[PDB]
Symmetry: D2
Subunit: 248 residues, 4 copies
């Protein structure tokens, strides 16, 4: 067990990669604070953990709303006493729209969740971790934190922004035993790709050196490692889980 006895929160844990991160955290021995904007989905992630013998609670949170983060931290402390680990996973792609046609609402929504929501979490999580001598934060960026994806300017800007705040937080709090890193997945087998035509899927696959898409477990395994004491000299860094996407 990588994470025995540690307390870990996951944002956007109701579905997709976040669900798998929460399950992996629990399987590694962590006490998990499941959160999502969807209580139905988040509740089911909680029930999944509990039915597998893990220790967890659920707390609602819209990561775009600063006040929700306070409630996360309070839930963590109430259930488990401290916060050791946090994964800022909640995020959306946005619609595919060329920049010149991207509306203010499109821009604002994606930045608000994917960038501001990460900042508001990280801010609250630092404060909680300082109470008890540090901790580990993992932000879910993307390949789009290092390269551009056409049609999703807001997403690319946000995901680059996540990479940047990781760097600054690492220096501000490394003295105090907070580690923070980003993870950059390439295309992962989640709902969006599941619903494109095979031909499109094959074109995405050929953009990876492994010539296939990733699975959510492949992302979660790296998040778990980075959240663990094995990763004790790793901070301020971007860790790809990209199947070689960025290498060409």
């Amino acid at each position: 067990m990588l994470l025995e006895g540690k307390t870990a929160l996951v944002t956007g844990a109701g579905n997709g990669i976040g669900r798998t991160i929460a399950l992996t955290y629990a399987a590694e021995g962590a006490n998990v604070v499941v959160s999502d904007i969807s209580d139905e989905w988040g509740r089911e992630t909680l029930a999944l953990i509990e039915g597998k013998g893990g220790k967890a609670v659920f707390q609602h949170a819209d990561t775009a709303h600063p006040e929700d983060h306070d409630e996360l931290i309070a839930a963590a402390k109430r259930a488990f006493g401290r916060l050791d680990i946090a994964c800022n996973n909640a995020g959306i792609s946005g619609e595919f729209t060329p920049t010149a046609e991207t509306t203010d609402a499109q821009w604002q929504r994606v930045i608000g969740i994917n960038l501001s929501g990460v900042f508001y979490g990280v801010r609250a999580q630092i404060r909680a971790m300082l109470e008890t001598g540090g901790g580990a934060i993992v932000n879910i960026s993307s390949i789009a934190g290092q390269i551009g994806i056409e049609g999703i300017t807001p997403y690319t800007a946000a995901k680059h922004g996540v990479v940047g705040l990781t760097k600054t937080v690492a220096w501000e709090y490394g003295s105090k035993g907070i580690r923070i890193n980003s993870v950059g997945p390439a295309f992962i087998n989640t709902t969006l790709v599941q619903n494109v035509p095979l031909e499109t899927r094959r074109q995405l696959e050929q953009m990876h050196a492994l010539r296939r898409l990733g699975e959510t477990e492949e992302v979660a395994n790296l998040v778990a490692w980075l959240s663990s004491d094995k990763a004790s000299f790793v901070t301020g860094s971007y860790y790809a889980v990209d199947g070689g996407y960025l290498a060409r």
Copy 2:
């Protein structure tokens, strides 16, 4: 002259690097649309250009307000009939504040100007440039688009985000005649930086391979070059003007 006959707008052109960019554009033969949130400083820049016999106008714009971009584009068209070049320079540092103490207002203000305001300008600028066959955009990022600077998480996130939206836009519009790049200055002798105490200056200098701070002309020269047809195979890229800051 690098830019003879071209029409260029500059945001944040009332002082600092933007003023020098505007001056440089005019000295290279461009018609200049000077804009700033401070109409006094913007009018000053205009006066400096006109005093040398350059062709320019001033138009107010707060880059954080989408509607002001439409008035910028309209001012360019009214004055000079087209838009060929745009430099998204307006930006603020924020106050130095550790992430855990950074307020919502601090985060939102810096993102709104330094990231959203760049997006809103780029969006307007693309649309205008496409009317007449394309053009060149230069976004002013920072070293903080590549590394972190303690105390300015908002700034770092924003400046990374600027790097990212440069990449997408370049691919979306590269076959349509629009080039876009980002410039990353290190510490530059604007009024504020000029006036730091000597012991602070020396501390900053030692962070640069050249063991000195930069001058606004040193930034503006690169911006001018990137805005010119000499730079016809240059797009989607980040150009440091950093005195070696990033190289260690």
Copy 3:
């Protein structure tokens, strides 16, 4: 155990980070082919592994000599029948010498070990891994694969080169079952670093966000993870273990 039943070779395994990698591989269940240019140090590593009941052999290899790689591969096959994992760790710093004073012999020696020797190993390792369906390679680069360190131009060039050949190999062999990644440590407490004067240690520490140097286990843990099937979507990439060094 991360690596149960796998056969792993380590270059430069007689001391320092390589010794710890070898130990870690064995503790994670791998059969280990320990190799080094120093047969005494290599035999010591072997003894440490065997003393705990691990399965291992020693084979001499100077990584700069192509033919020694063939004997490594042959030793793996003879002992354990296949090769699943390889870590190209052997490396030297060179002496600190400004570029203008660096001799041909200094340049050639460091490139020969740290760059050519990595290539010669990777080449042999690919061929062997392909016999049995693929495998995982980890190259030890450095922070000096991403930034420069004054006085060690040869080292910096070599370590950048290691980063680059990781990328090509990942694409060439990613559909054939071979993953390859590079690891970038900052300053680590090997024997030499352990023994620097306190005022030098403190100067180095301040270059890391964690305000301390790393331990060999902190490197080895990442190498083990990257060598395992948990890392199945990770290829072509650079993984810092740098305590935040690169983030400023």
Copy 4:
């Protein structure tokens, strides 16, 4: 004129990008020291410059041979008194060969020219520039200094290595007024691409945001700028001339 009165040497100036760099340097007012391994080609570059009214000399040099660099520097001083600018352009692609099948000779030849030859030049050029208070060096890397190109592991390793030694030299000599930068072209219209089928050319073109290949002048224009006093705060940096290749 960007370079009036400065003395500039170019390696590999007999053909391709290097020829165009030498011509551009001369057109910008520099005194040019043309060098190549091919005296026939280099002599013709000299005659081209002279027939256009420029000032230049030719000196043979195989960049792989350290002693040849001494002869370059001596030629520069003999003709023109000092060395202000140097462009380390000479380079080869190598054959396209998967890593596992790349021979020692292939590896050694490409590293010897593209990496060691750059080091030997830079070493000699620093020494000469220090005599007269500094100067500017431009190394020609590639997109393959930042990403991998299948089939050319040696080339990718070398071109990454060039990026690295740029960083270290910038810090070692920035105090002393030596600037050094790398340039990274994507696919440029030179002999190789001229001889592939259209279909292949179109596939390469689609890898660039501009959806076309670069021209040698587009590279030379950036080299000229970086070699000039306009670029006085630019050091230690990688400058793409990639048509957006790296942005995806």
